[PDB]
Amino acid sequence: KKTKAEVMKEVIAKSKFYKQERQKAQGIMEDQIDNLDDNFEDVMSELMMTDLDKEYDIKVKELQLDKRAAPSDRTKTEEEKNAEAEEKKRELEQQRLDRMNG
């Protein structure tokens, strides 16, 4: 009975969500039908009419003219690099053994 009531409550809430979605869609359709034209006509009949910017423009011009970049990553440990090389060598040796096997 509890699971049946759970299914019933979930279905009721889903139906409520679907009804809300349908109402929202109907409202949006009514808006697109009438308020769209009303707002278009009203906007046609109506009207609606720097230091940082200069610094940014100067910086952009300088970046276009000249550049000096070195995206160098952080240096890793020599022991870590040697271990990685050893692992790569082990993988290569295993691949060679597998190739020899078939």
Binding site: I28, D38, E62, K67, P71
Partner: protein, 261 residues
């Protein structure tokens, strides 16, 4: 005073946007961008009540269709208001997925982001959490190199603060193109952070934060060559005077051994 029909249509469009996060936008919204009074239409519709997905869709439409200055101003205003509202609403100062999508669209818009939105957020003084979130979003979606260099230079020219420092840290993580003037701006910001022993300064004698220390470490790792011998020595002096212990040594070493432009 807007007409009665204009007010009714704008209110209907605003309510449709508020109650709609999925589906199709109204023809009112589809035709509002086709007019010149976009700001007036937005003000009449009260777009501050819209939903996050609707706001993201509107921002994308403004970026794709509207012009440079009009969409730039509209994006600046709407994005600043929405960011403040979302930061206030979220207890942990978190954003929504649609908000992040709209932010990515605004960042792709070069004029509306640095001049319109990033300038607005920095000028309004976004908090530390907001600055960190902005740095994460920028590292996720870096903008064009010219805009990135311009924003980095603007942040360097602006005084040292939480938002400018976090923007500088994000730019250092991105590792964009640094011109001669960009490297000069970075060195000027470093000098402004560093102390001077006739007229002293608050930002000169102040202590830098961990975000600033990490930004300085990344800058020393990356843009050593953009700094000449004099700028490298200046960075070494900054690491000695107003530097750190765990990050200050690497900063001094990179400033001493870095290439010159």
């Amino acid at each position: 005073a807007l007409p009665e029909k204009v007010i009714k249509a704008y209110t209907t469009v605003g309510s449709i946007l508020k109650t709609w996060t999925h589906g199709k936008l109204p023809k009112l919204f589809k035709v509002i961008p086709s007019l010149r009074n976009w700001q007036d239409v937005i003000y009449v519709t009260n777009p501050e009540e819209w939903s996050p997905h609707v706001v993201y869709e509107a921002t994308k439409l403004f970026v794709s269709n509207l012009t440079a200055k009009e969409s730039q101003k509209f994006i600046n205003l709407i994005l600043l208001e929405r960011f403040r509202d979302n930061i206030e609403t979220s207890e942990d100062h978190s954003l929504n997925y649609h908000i992040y999508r709209a932010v990515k669209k605004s960042l792709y818009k070069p004029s509306a982001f640095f001049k319109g939105f990033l300038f607005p957020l920095v000028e309004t003084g976004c908090n530390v959490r907001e600055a960190t979130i902005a740095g994460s979003v920028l590292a996720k979606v870096s903008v064009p190199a010219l805009h990135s260099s311009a924003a980095l230079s603007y942040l360097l020219r602006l005084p040292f603060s939480p938002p400018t420092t976090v923007f500088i840290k994000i730019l250092l993580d991105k590792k964009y193109a640094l011109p001669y003037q960009t490297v000069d701006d970075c060195v000027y910001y470093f000098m402004r952070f560093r102390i001077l022993d006739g007229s002293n300064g608050e930002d000169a004698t102040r202590v830098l934060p961990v975000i600033w220390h990490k930004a300085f470490l990344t800058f020393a790792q990356r843009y050593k060559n953009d700094i000449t011998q004099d700028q490298r020595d200046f960075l070494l002096e900054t690491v000695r005077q107003r530097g750190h212990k765990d990050i200050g040594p690497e900063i001094r070493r990179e400033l001493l051994a870095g290439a010159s432009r």
